[PDB]
């Protein structure tokens, strides 16, 4: 008669590492790191993202005529801008504080387009000739932005001082846009706005703005030697905007009612396809369906994702050393 003491073993060939030893086979281990992703964009919180398609954030939000597919209200869990989208700022110029604008739209959830200033707000000028071959729609060779209006002096007389007002009596902030036109010479400036010094001024409770033209000859971009300084702002609930200009005004026409998320919000520059699926974690590289703690796919995500890490594998040993014989 006898009796022996010993330990478990099995067919497992799963290996881990320790400080003292590498490549060590154990009976039961667990993988904490996920490396598998579904290369696609899904819905978050049952809400679908926004495919900007052949439009950039600029062309979308400024109402580029070839971005009419995006026109109107939008709601998104996140935003997808396409790596080679062609439709942005068609008439040459700079959108002041563009990066901050992107950060702000990123921190968003929904917009509602509305008319903030009908063309009748601008008295005694020509609100129906403001076009250019630089900003065509899919149907004609000369249009302009859907949210702006290009004011030009009436077909004879000079440019009168024009005023506009919008009292935001609502409960939501208003994202809006305007611009200053910078002509290439004196004769163009005169042809469009007439002589005399010109100004563009805009006031709210917590923001003022004043600028004159900066007439000079620039390199040809989109067949235009002129430029436009585009500007954006947020009219808060209770704030009211005064617009006053005697010339060179690219006046706001349509604006957006903005909804702030308070949560993260993400804007992804990616070419991955958006499918009719759901997800709880969404990286720029794809979807993670895991119960694991770590992940080596991507640091950029929206939703609830594992901690990003550079490792290949994080094997943790739960069982003992395997010694079959």
């Amino acid at each position: 008669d006898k009796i022996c003491i010993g330990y478990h073993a099995n067919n497992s060939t799963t290996q881990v590492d320790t400080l003292l030893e590498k490549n060590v086979t154990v009976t039961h281990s667990v993988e904490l790191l996920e490396n598998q992703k579904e290369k696609r964009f899904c819905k978050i919180m049952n809400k679908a993202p926004l495919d900007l398609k052949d439009c950039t954030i600029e062309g979308w939000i400024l109402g580029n005529p070839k971005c009419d597919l995006l026109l109107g209200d939008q709601s998104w869990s996140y935003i997808v801008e396409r790596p080679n989208a062609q439709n942005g700022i068609c008439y040459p110029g700079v959108l002041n504080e563009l990066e901050e604008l992107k950060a702000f739209i990123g921190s968003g959830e929904r917009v509602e387009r509305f008319e903030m200033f009908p063309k009748s707000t601008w008295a005694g000028v020509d609100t129906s000739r403001g076009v250019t071959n630089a900003c065509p729609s899919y149907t004609l060779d000369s249009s302009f932005y859907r949210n702006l209006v290009w004011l030009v002096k009436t077909d004879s007389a000079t440019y009168p001082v024009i005023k506009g007002t919008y009292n935001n009596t609502g409960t939501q902030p208003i994202l809006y846009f305007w611009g200053v036109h910078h002509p290439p010479d004196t004769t163009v400036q005169d042809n469009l706005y007439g002589s005399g010094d010109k100004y563009v001024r805009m006031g709210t409770e917590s923001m003022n703005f004043a600028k004159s033209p900066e007439i000079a000859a620039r390199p040809a971009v989109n067949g235009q030697r002129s430029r436009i300084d585009y500007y954006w702002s947020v009219l808060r609930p209770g704030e009211t905007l005064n617009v006053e200009s005697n010339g060179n005004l690219i006046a706001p026409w349509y604006a957006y009612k903005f909804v702030s998320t308070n949560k993260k919000g993400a804007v992804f520059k990616s070419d991955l396809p958006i499918e009719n699926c759901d997800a709880t974690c969404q990286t720029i590289a794809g979807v993670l369906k895991t119960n694991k703690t770590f992940q080596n796919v991507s640091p950029l995500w929206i939703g609830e994702c594992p901690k990003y890490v550079k490792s290949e594998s994080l094997r943790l040993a739960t069982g003992l050393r395997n010694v079959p014989q």
Binding site: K2, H8, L98, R321
Partner: protein
């Protein structure tokens, strides 16, 4: 191991025992068989499940990078942000890998210690009534049936009875 048990004086493991981590192979008149010590086994299971859950719990935060864009004249702050993201990434990678390696070693040492402690738990009951081969096996001098092996297993072996 550092307690010498696993892959030491107990040179190998039993693929026969499939109902636990640590256990017994007895040998008598009614026949042999394998059976695991559920007590020390369950202790190890609870302890290790606790270790894993604690680790997963302490790792439940996420540094979050952002899609933020920086202009041509924003080189410095952009590089600042990059350096920060990279930095945190580095520290979390390090923490992860290091914690894994360390805890793995300590877990193996734990199993080893459990085996050694069981062996000692046995050797402390049977002193003169058996023969210690030195390889985790004990050859009785007297006879031992089923209610005999079972008494040893549930820790109630009566030494005075079998000392004679």
């Amino acid at each position: 191991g550092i307690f010498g048990a696993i892959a030491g004086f107990i040179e190998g493991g039993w693929t026969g025992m499939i109902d636990g981590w640590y256990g017994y192979h007895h040998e008598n008149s009614q026949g042999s068989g394998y059976a695991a010590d559920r007590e020390s086994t369950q202790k190890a299971i609870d302890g290790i499940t606790n270790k894993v859950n604690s680790i997963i719990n302490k790792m439940n935060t996420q540094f979050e990078a952002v899609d933020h864009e920086f202009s041509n004249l924003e080189r410095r702050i952009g590089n600042l942000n990059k350096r920060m993201e990279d930095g945190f990434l580095d520290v979390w990678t390090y923490n992860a890998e290091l914690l894994v390696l360390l805890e793995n070693e300590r877990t193996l040492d734990l199993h080893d210690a459990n085996v050694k402690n069981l062996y000692e738990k046995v050797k402390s009951q049977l002193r003169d009534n058996a023969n210690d081969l030195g390889n985790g096996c004990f050859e009785f001098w007297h006879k031992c049936d089923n209610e005999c092996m079972e008494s040893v297993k549930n820790g109630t072996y009566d030494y005075p009875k079998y000392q004679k």
